[PDB]
Amino acid sequence: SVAILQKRDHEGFGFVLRGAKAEPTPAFPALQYLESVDVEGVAWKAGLRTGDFLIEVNGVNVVKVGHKQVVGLIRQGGNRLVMKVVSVT
């Protein structure tokens, strides 16, 4: 599923990313996921939901990428963020 995020300078995208730090059967489709999403925030507006797993950030594959590096990627694109997510629910 796709979400295009364009925010204003001083707001967030409105979500909490959570997942393994960089330091059998797949149960997660990716290492980082949305622990929560701000109701009526830029991220919730684009359709993102708690429990969405991050597959791509701004065209980059982040399935196996540690947390800080993914946050790094999400920030590089300033107020613009593109995400391919997968819902486990």
Binding site: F13, G14, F15, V16, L17, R18, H67
Partner: peptide
């Protein structure tokens, strides 16, 4: 595990 508000 880490969490980041974004």
């Amino acid at each position: 595990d880490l969490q980041t508000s974004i």
